[PDB]
Amino acid sequence: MLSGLNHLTLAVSQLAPSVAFYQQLLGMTLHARWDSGAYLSCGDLWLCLSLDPQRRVTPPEESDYTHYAFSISEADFASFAARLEAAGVAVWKLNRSEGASHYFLDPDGHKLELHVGSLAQRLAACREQPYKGMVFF
Amino acid sequence: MLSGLNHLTLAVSQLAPSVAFYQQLLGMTLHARWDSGAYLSCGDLWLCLSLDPQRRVTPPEESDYTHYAFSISEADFASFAARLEAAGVAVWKLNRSEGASHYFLDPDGHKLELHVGSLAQRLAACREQPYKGMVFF
Ligand SMILES: [Mn+2]
Ligand SMILES: [Mn+2]
């Protein structure tokens, strides 16, 4: 059967600024780069940045809610979010509708998130503060 | 410090067909559903489907290369691809890289992939046959 996410590939409009964002600003590990892409890891996540002439820099009001959240510990969350803010990283959402999260944009407007907590923890929180109509299986 | 992918959230135009696709066709585990979304798991992956009226059913020619690949074993790959084909799921690309890959679309046009092989396997292949301009770190 399917066993998890093998990789996440993000189309990027300018490779070097995107590599810098994920490696330098977010601290991911850069393994290789070439004229049209890069491979990074974030823990077990395999991230591929793919240079795509079709990628547009997209304001958050023009894109849907599809987004990519990265795990961070409770001890590191606030200072990492504050560092992104001080670095001028654009945002896209303020209301914490799914727990302790910071919502920010990559250089092309990909919707990213820092989140503290697992699915199990989110389900437990939702049992007390459920979303409208919520059913648990 | 970021420790991995926390969750992937896909915006969906119609919740019921998206739940059917990910739970029933793709075999993911449905943990909860509410009036405007669902939580599923696939191995370690936490998947959220978020009902979003801004999601367009998007032809593959009209979206960039951003895509989400799920892991499957080599032994299971061909029968899973055949299941998708029987269900009439559209393909958006043929495989031309190392490791088996099946490129298929979700009901809203999210670009998905089945892939066999790790980052380590890809890097080993690239070391032997580097892409144009490739540098390793
Ligand atoms: Mn999220
Ligand atoms: Mn891929």
**Method used experimentally:** X-ray
Give the chain A residue nearest B118 (alpha carbons).
Answer: A6
List phi, psi (to 5°) of A17. Answer: -60, -35
Hey, what amino acid is at A82?
Answer: A
Give the chain B residue nearest A26 (alpha carbons).
Answer: B2
List phi, psi (to 5°) of A16. Answer: -65, -45
Distances (CA, A) of A63 to A136, B24, B53, B55, B130: 29, 28, 11, 8, 35
Query: Which strand (E) or helix (H) includes residue A134?
Result: none
| N-terminal to C-terminal alpha carbon distance within chain A | 20
Instruction: Give the span between the Cα atoms of A125 and A5, in whole angstroms.
Output: 25
Contact by Cβ (8 Å): B33, B23: no
The edge-to-edge listing of strands for the beta sheet with A5-12 is B91-93, B101-105, B111-115, B67-71, A5-12, A45-51, A37-42, A29-34, B135-136
Q: Decide: helix, strand or coil at residue A33.
A: strand
Residue A38 in tokens: 């890069």
Residues of A in contact with B67 (CB under 8 A): 9
- Does B126 sit within 8 Å of A66, measured CB to CB? no
Which one-letter DSSP state was computed for residue A10?
E
Instruction: Give the span between the Cα atoms of B58 and B64, in whole angstroms.
Output: 11
Instruction: Tell which residue, A85, A84, A121, has the closest CA to residue A100.
Output: A121
The distance of B57 to chain A (nearest Cα, Å) reads 11
Instruction: Give the span between the Cα atoms of A90 and A102, in whole angstroms.
Output: 11
Distance of CA B63 to the CA centre of its chain: 15
List phi, psi (to 5°) of A67. Answer: -160, 165
The distance of A66 to chain B (nearest Cα, Å) reads 4
Q: Which of A6, A72, A76 to mutate to test the interface with B (most CBs of B within 10 A)?
A: A6
Going along chain A from its start, the domains and CATH numbers come out as 1-137 (3.10.180.10)
Q: Which of A13, A14, A65, A79 to mutate to test the interface with B (most CBs of B within 10 A)?
A: A65
Instruction: Give the span between the Cα atoms of A113 and A67, in whole angstroms.
Output: 7
The distance of A76 to chain B (nearest Cα, Å) reads 7
What's the 3-state SS for chain B? CCCCEEEEEEEECCHHHHHHHHHHHCCCEEEEEECCEEEEEECCEEEEEEECCCCCCCCHHHCCCCEEEEECCHHHHHHHHHHHHHCCCCEEECCCCCCCEEEEECCCCCEEEEECCCHHHHHHHHHHCCCCCCEEC
Residues of B in contact with A122 (CB under 8 A): 39
Instruction: Give the span between the Cα atoms of A123 and A130, in whole angstroms.
Output: 9
